[model samples]
Each structure stands twice: as C-alpha cells, then as structure tokens.
Target: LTESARIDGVSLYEIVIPMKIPFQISSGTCYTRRSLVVEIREGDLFGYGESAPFEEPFYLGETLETTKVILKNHLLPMILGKEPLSIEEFNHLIKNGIRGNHFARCGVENAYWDLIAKKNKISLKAMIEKKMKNLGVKQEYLASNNYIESGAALGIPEDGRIETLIHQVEESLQEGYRRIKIKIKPGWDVEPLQETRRAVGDHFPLWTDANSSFELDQWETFKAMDAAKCLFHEQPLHYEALLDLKELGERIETPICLDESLISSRVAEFVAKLGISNIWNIKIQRVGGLLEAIKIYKIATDNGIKLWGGTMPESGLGARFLISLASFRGFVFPADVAASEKWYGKGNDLVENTMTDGKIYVPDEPGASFDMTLSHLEALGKKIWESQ
Candidate 1:
C-alpha cells in the first residue's frame, strides 16, 4: 500500500458562530466569528479540517473572500484528482502553486491529514507521531503526554473596568485553568494588569497578548507590563515590524512571544536568528496546517524558544486537532485551547470539548474525534460548496 491516497473532492463550508460576548483584541471586536471548514473525500472515507480566519482582516491580511478564492481557484486543484505521496508533498504542491494564504492552505492540508488517517484506520495522533518520526523529529519533540496543561483566556471586558477584569481572572482560576491570558491594548494596559496581579497575587501564571497594537516608542507602557511580571507579552509591535520587536525585546524584561509576527518557517527562522522573541505561539491555521506548525515548532524548540499552541476559538473538530497538535512535549507552556463553551456560550456547536481540571486529554479515537450529526451542522452552518 502506498503512503498516500487520491483526493476525490474538496468541499468547503462557510460557518459563522455568534459569540455570547464579543471577543475584543487590539485589532477589533468580534460579535460573530466567521470561519471555514474543508472536507476531503476519497471513496468511503473523508477527513475534516477547519479554517477560522477572523471575519475582519485585522489579524492578518487574509479574509473569508481571499481564503475561498485561493482554495477554489488555486489550492484545491493540486490535489483534486491526484494522489499526493504524503501530506508534506500536498503542502509543498499548494505552496508552490500560490504564495501565502496559510489560512486557506491549512484547512485543506489538515483535511487531507484526517482523510489519510481515516483511510489508514489509525488515530490522528498516532499517525502524526509516525509522520514526525519519518521527518527526523527529535525524541524530545516527539515525546508526548496523554493530556496537555490547559489555560483560559479573558477577552478585555467591554466596560474596561479593572474590577471586572479581576473577576474574570478569578473565575478562570476557580474553573481550574492552570494559566491565564488577558487581551490588552494601549489604554487598557496598566491598571488592569496591576489589578489582576493584586487579585491573583504575584505568583499566578499570567500573560497578555497585545495583538500588535503598540508602536516601538511605547516602551514605557510595555516596561510597566514587564514590571507586572507577566509570563510574557505577545506581539507588542506590528506584525511586519521585526526590527522594532528586536529593539523592544531588548528593553523589556518580560519574554516577548511572537504571534502574528512569525507566519511561515522562513520568517520564523529569521525571527529565531534575531533572538528577539523568547516564545512562539504556534497557531495551526495561522502558520498553514500541522506540518508547517510542526516544522516551526521543531525550529523554535531547537533554538531554545518555548512553544505554546494558539487558537482561533475553533469548534470541537478544530479543538480536537489542537489537542493532538499540542500534546508534544515541546509545548512547555499552557496552551490557549480553552473549552468550546468559553467562546460559543450555549450555541449549538456540533461537538463539545470540555476541560477536565485544567487539562484536555488526547483522543484515542481515529480521525478528528468530533461527533456531530449532519442535521446539527445544517442548523448552525450551511454548506457553501461541494465537489461533484
């Protein structure tokens, strides 16, 4: 048997979920999360992958329109009827065909990963570990635990009150989050940080993601954050401004974690060489699928940089993918893969991913391990396109 399979059809869905409370970051506020999912079908087996580009283009330059066009016109063609040798080859084919639509490319690539594992009748985790070994993954990188330490993220309260922020932090702790991350922008920075610190006390694991909202000159503000003794400050400068990040990293005591700044392994290697960021937030979609993510993870970990898995508040299927991806030992820090209810409120998500004692256990089952009926998906989402 060959190591790969033929792709019969690639289906795409435009799914939108309404947030119970708006999730706000430096870029903008989101009331509804518009996302995409790809289903790659071959014979009786099909694999699913989710793409969650923010409805707004603030996070990256890619939007739903661009992602759709790239997938429909460009990325899907390379694998539609062809039997790619491996996920890595499919990834290379897509990248060579198009430039940088990581979000779009990731959805299809992940779906193929699932499809192959389903075709092989093995769990996704087991298959991924096998692939990692074949790729010359170091033992340390391949070492994985059954469960990953989970964390909670508090979006900045709409009221922007320190008391409210503190309460949020307290709630997350009460619910068994091992670490806490709060979104922070310019005006909402100092006081909230101080208040949360005072409430959670000095030793609590706390960090802030600025989402590239500040300028290099805003050193004093970040200095105050450093004084707060945060675990790290994420993407304080613009995504494209690495030199400023290099300068800012020198001025701040808190380790700088690069989020949006490092997109591809090319740029990630560039940033790693500069030694500006002490940590890397590996979002599977942001960097283009698990293969790219694993590549970046190996590169960063090899260079002594800490890794934390990031998320786009993905639904249960996507959550399952994250859990499997983050299980590797190199992800030393608690990840942002919070339970699904944290973002969707009581909305009818197809499947549920709950945290048990601040941890998410790895799924032993095959494929993505997301259980949802077709009718349920139809109620909450619509199939945008399907291959014939």
Candidate 2:
C-alpha cells in the first residue's frame, strides 16, 4: 500500500543580508534585503521555498512580519494535518479561507511543489511539464528549454547620470550578460538610454523599468523611449494605470510590458483584452508560486502575448525556482535571474546555480534541487517558527 504525503513540520527562517553596494530603485535606496525561507518536511524528506517580500511594504504590499503572521494565522493550519492534494486542489483550499494574500501563500505553496516533486522522484521541471501536458495545455505550453538565457537588472544611479548608466551597461557586457535592463524615472529616463544606445551601438538588447514612476502626462517621454529603440519599456505608469497604458500604447511604437499591474491571470486577461501592454513579466512570488504563474503563462500564451521571468534579487533557492519556471517556452526573453555574487557580492549560497556564458542551466534532479544543510542555516539564519 502507498502512503499519502502528510507534512509533519514547517520551519521558517528570517535572514537580513546587506548589499555590498547600496541598491537604488525608483521607490528608494536599500542597504539590506530581508527574506524568509520555509522548509516543509514529512519524516526525513523536506521541501524548501523562499519568500521575497521587500524589507519594506513598497513592492507588493507585504512585509516580512506581515507574511509570517498570515502564514501562522491562516495558511498553515489548513495543510498541517491533511494528506497532500493536487496543486489545484491545495490552491482552492487556501482560496476558500482567505483571498489576496498571494505573497504568504506563495512561500508555502512552493514548498509543497518541492515536496510533491520529490515524492514522485522526478525533477521539478519534469513534474511541471508533465502536469501541463496532462491538462492538454498545448504543445507550445510544454516546451522545456532546459537552459535560460540571462540578463542584468541595473538600478539607476543615485545621481542619475548618463555616464554612470553607460558605465554599468559596459560592465554588464564585459561580464557576458546576454541583455541589459536599467531602472528609469522622470529625469533619468530618455537621456541615459539614448547615451547607452549610442555607446553600445544598435545590436545589443536593452530595456528600462519605471517602477510605476510616470503618468499619462508624460506621453512624450515614452515617445523618447521609443526613439531610444528599447526592446520594451516596463511599468511605465502606475500599477492600475490601464487607461494610461492603453493611451501610451496608442502613442508610442515601443512595446509596453506590465509588471506591478500583473497580479493574476484574471488581471492578465483584463490587460490583454484592453491591448494596453504587449508583454508580461511573470514573477513567481507575485502570483502565489509556480502554479498560478503557469496559469498566467498559459493565459498570456493563448492570448498571443509575450512573457518573461523576473526576480526580486532572490537567494539561491528562490532564483532556482525561477530557473525552473523559465525552462518553458513561455519565457521568450533572458530573465533577471543573474548570478548570486551579482547581488550578494560574498558568502556561499545554500544552493548555488552558476551561470556559464550568459545562461543558467535548469536542474534535472528531483524537487527544487537545492542544498539546505543545518550547518548553513544555523550559521546564517535567525529561526522564526519551528514545529513542536
């Protein structure tokens, strides 16, 4: 007789790592990035996941403290005593209790994905592909590319200089990144891209992110971006700025990609139906883990929209999940999943996926294919919750 999987323990870790260089974004500058690590186990086999909430509540409206409370108070009790269900069943079970806590649900759901893949003795990529095909998702939805071409996500300089932007792109090119994406705001928007385009010439792939820093009044600025020949412009306006995005779409020839505005496949359809944005940036954490992200993937692919994987400067394990997601053909561009040292600058990752020649190899091993030794955790983490 086969035994069903029942999770016995859920452990949480809160780690704060300071950046070697203070990272700058449109919202603010950050010195340290705080993340949550979750480990779910049944006997000796454990599956792992990471939560990428910002140290503050700016990004996706969930802080580390709030996510922990949501998990402890609501998401965990529903799963602790039950046999594992299908991914769809589990997601529905949680949605029945509470809605709109995507970040909190994402951390635990990812762990569940790991556990199921391990139980089946199949690589996580293989398991996901199998599930997709079983659902008759389409031949396009089942492409397992196995390796992801990678890009560099550089922040705008605090001074917002054209020279500094050019320098960063030059450095990324020197390091062998396949593409470059720069963060942009009102004053820093068009000029830097223009200068970099001139310096790097026309063949290189380049783009910019606004982090929702612009409004409809700045239509001409995006026209300048179109002039700069960016492959695409991301999050050019407010999160719910669909009307403005539609307006911007009418104004410029450059493709507009939605990031903050894309929360789920429902939202994706709304955006797609309006024809506001041409591309979607699918971040696993933002959509409550891989299943939901895949839903968005199929939705976008079905609607003839482009999709790509994005990151929040996640740890090794978190980035590994992205690598697995990007293995599918839905992701048409180089992801923001750079090497660990690009973000941390030092210290060993619990499970490192090294990039060779501007690409990351997807793991063929069972589950998430991460190494989580107690020695590393005890040394690097502050424990939050451990099962009694």
Candidate 2 whole-model C-alpha lDDT, 0 to 1: 0.79
Clashing pairs in 2: none
lDDT of each: 0.79, 0.79
TM-score of each: 0.93, 0.94
Candidate 1 achieves a global lDDT of 0.79
List model 2 lDDT by residue over 1-388, tens digit each. 1224687887888867666666664357877667788777888887788887765788767877788888777777667766755777777766778687777788787888888778778787886777667666679678778799998887877675677778888898888888888888898888888887777777888888888899989989888778778789888899887888878878888888898899987888777787877788989888878888877777787788888899876777777778888878878889998476666664555566777889999988877744657777666578877763
Clashes of 2: 0
lDDT of 1 by residue, 1-388 (tens): 2358888887887777777666664467677667787878888777888877765576677878888888887777666887889777888877888887888888888888778777777777887788777777788789899888888887778786777888888888899999988888899898888888777888988888887879999888988776689888888888888888888888878878888877888888878888878788988888888888878877887788888887876767776777887888888889888476766764355466777899988887777834655566677678887764
Residue 264 in candidate 1, Cα distance off native in Å = 0.8
Residue 201, candidate 2: Cα error in Å is 1.6
